[PDB]
Amino acid sequence: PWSEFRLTPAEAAAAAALAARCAQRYDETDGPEFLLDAPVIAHELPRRLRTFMARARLDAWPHALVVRGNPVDDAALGSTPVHWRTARTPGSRPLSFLLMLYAGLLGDVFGWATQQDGRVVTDVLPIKGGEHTLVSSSSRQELGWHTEDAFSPYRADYVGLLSLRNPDGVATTLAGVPLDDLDERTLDVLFQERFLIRPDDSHLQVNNSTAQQGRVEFEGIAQAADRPEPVAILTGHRAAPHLRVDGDFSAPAEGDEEAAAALGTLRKLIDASLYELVLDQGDVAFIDNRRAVHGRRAFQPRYDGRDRWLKRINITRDLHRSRKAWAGDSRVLGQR
Numbered sequence: 001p002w003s004e005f006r007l008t009p010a011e012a013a014a015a016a017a018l019a020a021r022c023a024q025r026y027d028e029t030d031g032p033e034f035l036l037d038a039p040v041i042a043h044e045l046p047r048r049l050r051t052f053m054a055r056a057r058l059d060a061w062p063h064a065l066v067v068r069g070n071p072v073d074d075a076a077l078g079s080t081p082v083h084w085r086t087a088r089t090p091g092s093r094p095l096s097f098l099l100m101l102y103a104g105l106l107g108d109v110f111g112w113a114t115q116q117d118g119r120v121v122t123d124v125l126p127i128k129g130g131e132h133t134l135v136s137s138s139s140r141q142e143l144g145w146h147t148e149d150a151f152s153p154y155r156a157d158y159v160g161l162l163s164l165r166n167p168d169g170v171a172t173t174l175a176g177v178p179l180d181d182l183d184e185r186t187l188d189v190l191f192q193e194r195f196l197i198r199p200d201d202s203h204l205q206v207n208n209s210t211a212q213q214g215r216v217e218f219e220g221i222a223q224a225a226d227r228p229e230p231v232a233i234l235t236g237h238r239a240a241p242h243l244r245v246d247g248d249f250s251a252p253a254e255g256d257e258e259a260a261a262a263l264g265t266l267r268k269l270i271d272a273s274l275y276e277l278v279l280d281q282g283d284v285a286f287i288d289n290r291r292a293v294h295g296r297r298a299f300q301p302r303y304d305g306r307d308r309w310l311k312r313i314n315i316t317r318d319l320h321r322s323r324k325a326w327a328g329d330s331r332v333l334g335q336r
């Protein structure tokens, strides 16, 4: 149910060399200079990869684009960080550049003023003490399926994930719209503005650095949690709908029992059709955040220096869509 590409060793080496050159010439991935240049530098990537990315983005069916075979040397990478705060390590640096180059072929990268301190390239790794939370640094508790940043109209079109290491083969989960099982009445209701979707816990002050917790953009998050506006779960074409839902942060509109039944049914059908994608070391996935929800299976964290670790990036097809929320400015979204 996804589109897959495997780099030849020569293609993988060339992409890696390009990323290393970028890491040599630019101070950081999230600086204005590399943010502007990366999409044009990405034109230098191996042609067969550029062809795959251009065409697979235009296919109607895939839930994700997956690129296999980027080499990662665990000795050069170093230990998995204890927290995302300290995760911009020299060993991970070139792979962060690599992810952004790949992302530049699909759209405009951006971050949130209220998530991981406004970073564009973010980290997914288990944090000691946070095993049973609702954020991506969880482990022992499964990360429930979700549209990334479901609460926001400016949420990503694609979510990029690059596996730095995943020694125990922990699966990312995915599901599309269960169109084979949704009856027309239920479908009709899911297309109506009868649902509430609150921001997830990654946007809370407690999950950002103490220095950031006075930022005005947390006000907007509070407003969205306290007074969510009713929206639709499904949009667009009835035979191939786009999806906006989060299994732990969605609810029906107040007292709307038909909407509740529709969401209840959708939960069961998504639970039933959820499938696994294992991102091995060096694998990159770009998840279609309109066609699919995603999550991550429960796993026992190691905390020994070799935990599963991904770099992540949010991608939009059009940054100008979010101008009302430009905060840091165009590339870091948030509102009062």
Ligand SMILES: N=C(N)NCCCC[C@H](N)C(=O)O
Pocket: 134, 135, 136, 137, 143, 144, 145, 146, 148, 149, 200, 201, 202, 246, 247, 248, 249
């Ligand atoms: N059903 C759940 N858990 N929803 C929230 C998922 C985590 C989202 C957030 N971007 C993060 O990286 O933590």
